[PDB]
Structure 1
C-alpha cells in the first residue's frame, strides 16, 4: 500500500500484516484522526518556512 501514492500518507508510511497501513510523522508533528495528515506540535517544525507560514 505504501509503494502506491505514499499509501495516502502526508509523511511516513508503514505496511502491516495484511491490507493494513499506518501513517506516521517526523518528530515535532502529530497524526490527525483522518490517519493520514500531520500537524505541527512545536513552534519551529522541520521543513516549514516561518516567514511563508505566517503570511
Structure 2
C-alpha cells in the first residue's frame, strides 16, 4: 500500500500484516483522525517556512 501514492499518507507510511496501513508524522507533528494528515504541534515544525505560512 505504501509503495503506491505513499499509501495516501501526508508524511510517513508503514505497511502492516495484511491490507493494513498506518500513516505517521515527523516529530513536531501529530496525525489527524483521518489517519493520513499531519498537523504541527510546535511553533517551528520542520520543513515549513514561517514567513510563507503567516501570509
Common fold: TM-score over 0.5: yes
Give the structure 2 partner of residue 35 of structure 1: 35
Gaps of 5+ in 2: none
Give the structure 2 partner of residue 45 of structure 1: 45
Q: TM-score, normalised by structure 1?
A: 1.00
Q: TM-score, normalised by structure 2?
A: 1.00
| CA drift at 1:51 | 0.1
What is the CA–CA distance in structure 1 between the aligned matches of 2:51 and 2:18, rounded to whole Å?
43
Count of residue pairs brought into register by the alignment: 55
Cα RMSD after superposing both structures: 0.1
| CA drift at 1:30 | 0.1
| CA drift at 1:20 | 0.1
Q: Which runs of 4+ in 1 moved over 6 A?
A: none
